[PDB]
Subunit: 277 residues, 3 copies
């Protein structure tokens, strides 16, 4: 199913989405370079617990349109606002994962929380990944991000194999917490995304969200794996926990970035406890 969020030349920009179940709406927002189907272990647990689960594919990924425009978090937050206004959701829960946590913060800051009950940040990028003089807790300098763009442009297909080795910590988890076949599914999903979004999305990951975080005025959850090699915990959740001390804060020791699959039981327990509160 599709929601139209914009236009590019002669074509509409349509996001693929799904809407399942009955109950309070929970909107699940994926990250690079996957799709809404990557939430399947959480969607099954939320449907059995009595929630309505909405997932969509961000622009440039999954089954959504693949424009060459609008790769910035303000546009990703506008796309989320169109999804929530078109479905007319109230008392919704926004749950972001990985790089999809950028539009959760930017939506709250720009559009406010009238439709929102709670927000959750899983393996998040906040508050500001770029290491600069005024941000010593950043993870890396600009050259690191330019390097990821040059590797995607050189051969995105081979890039995804090295990316998923560090996303799931395959040297530790292949064969035990993730199978070869689930990794193959993730590679197929990345290869179906748009070529232009794959090389443009890395330029958004050094957006500064420090001014957005104090605008969060609803209950929040911050969850992160301490073995994350993609978004290191010392530069992301441990700094975010100091900026937003009201949030529930959960560290999953040893988990990688791709913990929605590898550590699904621990993620589901923490999400269900936060949703019931």
């Amino acid at each position: 199913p599709f929601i139209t969020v914009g236009q590019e030349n002669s074509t509409s920009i349509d996001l693929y989405y799904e809407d399942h179940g009955t109950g309070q709406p929970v909107v699940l927002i994926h990250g690079f370079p996957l799709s809404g189907h990557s939430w399947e272990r959480q969607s099954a647990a939320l449907l059995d617990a009595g929630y309505r689960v909405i997932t969509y594919d961000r622009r440039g990924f999954g089954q959504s349109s693949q424009p060459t425009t609008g790769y910035d978090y303000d546009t990703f937050a506008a796309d989320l606002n169109t999804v929530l206004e078109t479905l007319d959701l109230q008392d919704a829960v926004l749950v972001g994962f990985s790089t999809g946590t950028g539009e959760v913060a930017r939506y709250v800051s720009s559009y406010g929380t009238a439709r929102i009950a709670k927000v959750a940040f899983l393996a998040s990028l906040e508050p500001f990944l770029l290491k600069t003089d005024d941000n010593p807790d950043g993870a890396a300098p600009q050259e690191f991000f330019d390097g990821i763009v040059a590797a995607v442009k050189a051969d995105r297909y081979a890039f995804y194999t090295g990316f998923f080795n560090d996303f799931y910590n395959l040297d530790e988890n292949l064969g035990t917490r993730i199978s070869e076949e689930a990794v193959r599914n993730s590679w197929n999903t990345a290869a179906s995304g748009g070529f232009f979004a794959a090389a443009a999305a890395p330029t958004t990951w050094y957006t500064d969200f420090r001014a957005d975080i104090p605008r969060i005025d609803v209950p929040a959850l911050i969850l992160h794996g301490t073995g994350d090699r993609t978004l290191p915990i010392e530069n992301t959740a441990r700094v975010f926990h100091k900026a937003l001390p009201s949030a529930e804060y959960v560290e999953v020791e040893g988990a990688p970035h791709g913990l929605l699959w590898t550590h699904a039981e621990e993620v589901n327990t923490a999400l269900l406890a936060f949703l019931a509160k």
Copy 2:
């Protein structure tokens, strides 16, 4: 192309279908966990023989919508009735394979045969797979089916590799009657189906069709491989042949469940003989 069969929350439930050729309509219904494209060796032979071939992807599979509702044979038969009424088919032939043979029997029993010339059951599940006191010919107890649901929920992607080894009898047929690349295609098609249908469909396979079978009042074909490890012939076609002795009955010695590919010549010969009669 799509036919709408229902609605789920804000979305429509749409089935992907194709409509090719000129002649008497033959509707081909696949089984778990494939799609209408799995009939390609039969569709090519039926098109060369002068038939119109309609294939569709059942709800939850292939390119169709992926709802979390309606996984029962009465709904699958309602979806088939919507396809036949929307296309306004007359004198049609219904050909089911594998678990898609359940809605062929349930459609005939609920809706009757005014639009139907003939029906065919290939590698079928009838009459009632569950072994109970009143059904000693059933294949297995309830716990077997619950086990398949728990294995799909644990990791559907790795489940499909073991499933296809027994679906095609790969220890006998890999390299001779089926290539590694055709198996890879089947895994890709299973992984594109919906996560909720994959774990829900196994709970429909122990439906009792014994009261539906005496309502079949048109010519019928029953075909099965004697090497089927998925739906064993002693619990399915040999018992169905006693319940419906009017049907043409064809055993293909040594063929597995996935015989539309591995034994396409023998299936096509038997289908073309039955269609011309």
Copy 3:
């Protein structure tokens, strides 16, 4: 996004297309058995240089409909005419690759060049691949083409692995100019195309375009790799260069048929020089 080009029984024949950028329109037409996404290394360079890039999937391939009718170059040229008339393109550049160069010549000959600024033929099939008495420069006799049809019908999935070994010259280029993952993407794209188009398209490759070539009355580029094992250069571009001596003519020594990937820098340099002229 989709453009409707025809109807087959109850369904429309829709071609998937994309429309990116701002500038003079450049329409990129792929060949067998890929899709418009195979132009990604050229589309990125044309977008950075200031052109509007339109790509579409030919009937039977990629994300387009999969009819069982209309596999001939006059219909493929009609589909291109519908794309150009629906988008109302003017001063457009048509760039064909591989077997998609047949509809570029047939469009110009049948419909004329009022909408067209320039045309380009990359790894092309012209002027007439069939070796006959009146065409001694043809590549092969009829039996060669019938053989490719019989190999696709026997098992298209395994056919694509041997096809891509000669399309990319993998014995020379695997690991250096093309990765295993980019080859896997190309196999996935071929397997998503329609089964009927895969076996029908080979019967179009021996169409005679000798009467179409003198109707080209706009600037043209002819580019080909001298290591092409799919469409040999001695039977195609070197004969076309004598038939159309006005065209710019570029040989890329040692490049295979799949040179849009393996030799993207040399293709992009020659395309950008021809577009600026």
